[PDB]
Amino acid sequence: VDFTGYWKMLVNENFEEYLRALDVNVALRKIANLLKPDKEIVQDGDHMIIRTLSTFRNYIMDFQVGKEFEEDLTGIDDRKCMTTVSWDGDKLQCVQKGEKEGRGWTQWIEGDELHLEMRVEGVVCKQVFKKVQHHHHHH
Ligand SMILES: CC1=C(/C=C/C(C)=C/C=C/C(C)=C/CO)C(C)(C)CCC1
């Protein structure tokens, strides 16, 4: 699988409960729930960049698959985790070790869809994005 591309959000299921389990404050949850971020992904060998792009703020991941790293979640819940993203067949599995139990996510492709299941403390949020071709500049 190659995740490289630009992807536009189609659905975002149960995001409020995911953010509440991360202790994101009420005012920021109100803002965040309205956002429909894009994903811009570049898979360059095992060097993976996943840019979560929104009109409010972006969240940038930039890591090596298979190598644990210190993930700085400033702008989300302002925690840090020891995070590992690994291949599991055609799926990408992420474990975010830290204060919250069961924190991580799974990402995969079906057809023209990027599927992303985010988890923390037994809460499940499911996002689906559609592959798109009209690009625009971002930071
Ligand atoms: C709460 C919050 C946000 C949440 C971002 C999230 C939850 C990003 C998850 C990224 C993953 C799981 C990438 C793998 O594709 C953004 C920054 C949009 C805007 C500010 C408030």
Residue 85, ligand 1, Cβ within 6 A: no
For residue 59, the CA-to-ligand 1 centroid distance in Å is 6
CB atoms within 10 A of CB 93: 15
**d(C-alpha 29, C-alpha 68), whole Å:** 29
Residue 75, ligand 1, Cβ within 6 A: yes
**d(C-alpha 121, C-alpha 111), whole Å:** 30
71: which residues sit within 8 A by CB, 6+ positions away?
61, 63, 80, 81, 82, 83, 96
Ligand 1 atom closest to 54 (CA): 18
Q: What are the b/e assignments for 27-36, b being 16+ CB within 10 Å? A: eebeebeeee
Q: How many domains does the chain have?
A: 1
**d(C-alpha 52, C-alpha 59), whole Å:** 5
Q: Which residues pair with 63 in a beta bridge?
A: 48
Residue 125, ligand 1, Cβ within 6 A: no
Chain position carrying tokens 């095992």: 46
Chain position carrying tokens 């690009």: 135
CATH of the domain at 106: 2.40.128.20
Tell me the two tokens of residue 23: 């202790």
Ligand 1 atom closest to 19 (CA): 1
Structure-determination approach: X-ray
**d(C-alpha 77, C-alpha 80), whole Å:** 9
Residue 81, ligand 1, Cβ within 6 A: no
Residue 105, ligand 1, Cβ within 6 A: yes
Q: Whose CA is nearest to atom 14 of ligand 1?
A: 50
**d(C-alpha 34, C-alpha 38), whole Å:** 13
Domain of residue 42: give its range: 1-139
**d(C-alpha 38, C-alpha 74), whole Å:** 19
